[PDB]
Symmetry: D2
Subunit: 260 residues, 4 copies
């Protein structure tokens, strides 16, 4: 249980980040959520965290592709919470194309959000954690932080970068009561992946669920998606005392992806 803890989850209006926020709230943490979406949906999400789980929840809109906005977001989050114990750097985007066709603006956007925002968020959070002598920074990388696939140059580069940055963060704060680790999921059926399933279905001329099976079979030996709830559970484990000496490392929940 994380009763009293103060958590921030970037990109928590959808997908994995939404489940992270839910699992941290369930465990007793106050939570700042963040990301894009319909205002009515986001306010329902925020108010739900409070009314279900009896914690405080805040939504702070910040486009984390901007460095100063990211650093300002962390300051505003810490002010809202009255502290900052757990930072989950989760927000991310995807774009698929071969390198020689890969849009320069998409490279920049993916590096900005998927890598640089992790740096800027970490930089802003660390002094708060260092002063209190406890912290968790939990970076959501990918199996694509450890291995590659075709047509994902920017994303694989960014996620490999996050895995490196995780190690540095850990080493710089070794022994201080602050850990930093990277959760490296395989496929999780969010909108980020549904777009890729749709693309396969159009390429192959097959129904969406046949396409989902093809997407899994290529990469993920279990032939089952990882769930957002499972990843929330992993984050709660990383936040626990059992993980006090788990730092600078990757926690792969990927159905066997990286085993082969």
């Amino acid at each position: 249980m994380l009763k009293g803890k103060k958590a921030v989850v970037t990109g928590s209006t959808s997908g994995i980040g939404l489940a992270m926020a839910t699992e941290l709230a369930k465990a007793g943490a106050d939570v700042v959520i963040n990301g894009f979406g319909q205002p009515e949906d986001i306010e329902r999400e925020r108010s739900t965290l409070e009314s279900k789980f009896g914690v405080k929840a805040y939504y702070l809109n910040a486009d984390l592709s901007d460095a100063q906005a990211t650093r300002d977001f962390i300051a505003k989050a810490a002010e809202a919470l009255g502290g900052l114990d757990i930072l989950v750097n989760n927000a991310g985007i995807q774009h698929t194309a071969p390198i020689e066709e890969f849009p320069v603006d998409k490279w920049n956007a993916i590096i900005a959000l998927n890598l640089s925002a992790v740096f800027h968020g970490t930089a802003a959070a660390l002094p708060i954690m260092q002063k209190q002598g406890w912290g968790r920074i939990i970076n959501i990388a990918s199996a694509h932080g450890l291995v590659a696939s075709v047509n994902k140059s920017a994303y694989v580069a960014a996620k490999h970068g996050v895995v490196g940055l995780t190690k540095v963060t850990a080493l710089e704060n070794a022994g201080k009561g602050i850990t930093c680790n990277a959760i490296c999921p395989g496929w999780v059926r969010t909108p980020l992946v549904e777009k890729q399933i749709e693309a396969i279905s159009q390429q192959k001329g097959i129904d969406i669920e046949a396409a989902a099976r093809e997407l899994l079979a290529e990469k993920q030996p279990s032939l089952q998606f990882v769930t957002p709830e499972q990843l929330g559970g992993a984050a709660v484990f990383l936040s626990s005392a059992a993980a006090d000496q788990m730092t600078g490392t990757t926690l792969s929940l990927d159905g066997g992806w990286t085993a082969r």
Copy 2:
């Protein structure tokens, strides 16, 4: 919670394995323990699991350096428990010397226990798990399954072997409800490590606690030992639903060892 589950922990009369057995019993699992020691100590350990935690506990003496004894041990364990849900392949030994001086009998003994017993135990357990469509095989490797140190040829080879074997086990049983992962601890202050601290203290002419600090500083950026209780917690996480799609991978609790 693991209520109803049936667990086997090899080398659980000391050190990490003893804490594993305790944490699994606390979670509600019946437990088979195993290993060498004083009969009075082992029976106190066994009876303690039952009287504290209200589970069934059995001690089965088997020297797991022998293949047939290991396979027979798993059969006897499953018979005692009435099943076998969770196998923790933990028993291990250490011997330090440079390669050209490394005793051939010590190479054989370390390979037999630290690697081959993991194969034989896994082979015996798998058909039981496959029939029921659920299982956890949790191999205790090391940071030395991922990187090396001097004067540990056999041990590093064995532990790298365990990490490879873990991946194969996972892949062969992908999707079946059975996962296999390797917990890779850094330094944990058990008798296996106390011998090495003592050796440093004699080499350097320093007290034992100064030697322990030197042993940590060389390898483990946090400058803190990993605890058996933390590793028990990791095993309980691996045994949980959150880890259903965690398979074929390493879970490093090593204070930053492998980050640098």
Copy 3:
């Protein structure tokens, strides 16, 4: 021998890149060099390649922190050479500081040059190599593309990114006659490292050569620098037929850094 081949080496006015250009010229390749420095030194370098080794050499000044300048540089290089067979993405910078103090402009500059320029250069080169059905892209990463050190967040992130990007490039061009690999040096005594030796010497109050020994001892088990000439040799190997099926991987010349 690489007789007839057409090579481009970024950041080849100093250090490792200068030796790369020399070794490729020695092997018979025409070479485009690139980077900052004194005009008289750079023209001596260029004319030396021609007069010693009997190849054609061109200097193209381009600040590769700019995407369009990098893509334009590759076009101009290919025009000068009459082709483009081998691209060595080598230019890089360093800055050391803890994350919470790490200048945002230095993060941006290191990501721009050490990572993004590798993407932009690769993107520009690939269509030329794809049309001819042969190519080598040789990325100069680091041991810090595989592991981390303190106070090098941007650099470690970038170099991990390069290692990921290398894998994608390889996979996208698998079987086409084009390979992409990352050379991952340990310490090499260039100006990039001499600054860090100087910083250690000031911190510890020791002479420069004692500081160099300390810098090695921390990271590099051989206690010897890797040389630019050795790395040139590695590049010539990667460019050879023996390495036709070496692709998507790292070639560590690091004196044992990543073994422990």
Copy 4:
């Protein structure tokens, strides 16, 4: 060129080891070959090395699954050569079956040859190299020393073990003029792989060359076999001065296998 050098290649009567011996002889090294086969074929191989390449060649029959025979083989090899500069630990076998069906005798045989012989050969060679202050130990691991496939428990365990042992050897002899590295091939069309192609062809009901294409497509993005000649070239590179500070690491020639 390796003129004057004295090399030993285990399992060099077939496949990769035969090409290793050839490439080392071409470079000017005297060579000891080893392995099973028809006496007339082996003597033709031995005499061919001498008559083509003008070096001395010796065949020493030793079953390297036996520790003492392996240590005695190295002594006899060094006596024949008048030294020992380069040891290539190459001999290996394969057997495919799921873990719960995997013959205990095959596990033992694969561990004995593919792992333990590397230890025993290294142990015997090292004192010779240490006395002269120069050496190369080149271990032939596999992509299966880094990742896994189904039905190869023993082999993957052994090859992961070799990769670990390589690191220890390197670290123990860091700075001494002795390096140790592991060449990690992907598929190479030797008899060891032809058996597996034949098995696929029977399973799928397809001709042998269609089966070979299937075997490649599953694992090896280039869709081309690695050749024994390429691997010989890699060994000659590792034996060169350019590789003086390459130690404790893996050299993957695997057509992209480990990139994804």
